[PDB]
């Protein structure tokens, strides 16, 4: 019945940059087109004294040569007039790691258990997203409570990304 246009997706009301600080463990993922981080993904969100948020992401990526680098990614976030929607500039500490600029939307979080991020890299002419990625973060390395799980699938369906996530392995590779 409802809207898959990106312009219509609801995000986190009055997103608190500081309450989202710290370690988030990626539990689930919806991959974009091309090369992306595979597994072992752990982000560290941070806010300095002026309200600027940054993050570091750690994760394993398989490069064409068939490398298995544990990428150390850095992202800085630019605020928009929506508190839960950011522009994220990112780069690897290694030169070979992918650099870019993506939207970063906090679709929902309760700050202490779960987060849902989304990024549409490209919009179709109808307003829907032709290439997106999404992550489901957990405060706990062992996942989400049945409770958090129900809300998170609700949100996935809302993002028109239901049934398009795969679980993330964490086996200490990095
Ligand atoms: C920086 C950053 C993030 C995104 C990282 C990406 C998109 C990395 C891609 C790396 C690639 C494609 C390497 C290829 O060799 C997420 C959203 C986790 C939040 C934390 C900060």
UniProtKB/Swiss-Prot annotation:
Omega-N-methylarginine sites (modified residues): 121
Chief subcellular location: secreted
Effect of residue 55 to T: In MCOPCB10; dramatic reduction in retinol binding; has greater affinity for the STRA6 receptor
GO molecular function: molecular carrier activity; protein-containing complex binding; retinal binding; retinol binding; retinol transmembrane transporter activity
Coiled-coil zones: none
Keywords: Disease variant, Disulfide bond, Methylation, Microphthalmia, Retinol-binding, Secreted, Sensory transduction, Signal, Transport, Vision, Vitamin A
Cited CDD domains: lipocalin_RBP_like (cd00743)
Tissues expressed in: Detected in blood plasma and in urine (at protein level).
Annotated binding of substrate, by residue: 98
Domain of life assignment: Eukaryota
Cellular component GO terms held in the UniProt record: extracellular exosome; extracellular region; extracellular space; protein-containing complex
Subcellular location: Secreted
Pathology noted in the entry: Retinal dystrophy, iris coloboma, and comedogenic acne syndrome: A disease characterized by retinal degeneration, ocular colobomas involving both the anterior and posterior segment, impaired night vision and loss of visual acuity. Additional characteristic features include developmental abnormalities and severe acne.
Subunit structure: Interacts with TTR. Interaction with TTR prevents its loss by filtration through the kidney glomeruli. Interacts with STRA6.
Function, as annotated: Retinol-binding protein that mediates retinol transport in blood plasma. Delivers retinol from the liver stores to the peripheral tissues. Transfers the bound all-trans retinol to STRA6, that then facilitates retinol transport across the cell membrane.
UniProt-recorded name of the protein: Retinol-binding protein 4
Naturally occurring in which organism (per UniProt): Homo sapiens
Taxonomic lineage of the native organism: Eukaryota, Metazoa, Chordata, Craniata, Vertebrata
């Amino acid at each position: 019945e409802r809207d898959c246009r990106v312009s219509s997706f609801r995000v986190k009301e009055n997103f608190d940059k500081a309450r989202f600080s710290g370690t988030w463990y990626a539990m689930a993922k919806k991959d974009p087109e091309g090369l992306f981080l595979q597994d072992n993904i752990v982000a560290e969100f941070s806010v300095d004294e002026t309200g600027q948020m940054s993050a570091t992401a750690k994760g394993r990526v398989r490069l064409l040569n068939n490398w298995d680098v544990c990428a150390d990614m850095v992202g800085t976030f630019t605020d928009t007039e929506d508190p839960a929607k950011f522009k994220m500039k990112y780069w690897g500490v290694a030169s070979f790691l992918q650099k870019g600029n993506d939207d970063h939307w906090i679709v929902d979080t309760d700050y202490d258990t779960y987060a849902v991020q989304y990024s549409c890299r490209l919009l179709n002419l109808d307003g829907t997203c032709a290439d997106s990625y999404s992550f489901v973060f957990s405060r706990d390395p062992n996942g989400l409570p049945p409770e958090a799980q129900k809300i998170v699938r609700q949100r996935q369906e809302e993002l028109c990304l239901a049934r398009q996530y795969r679980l993330i392995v964490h086996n200490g590779y990095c």
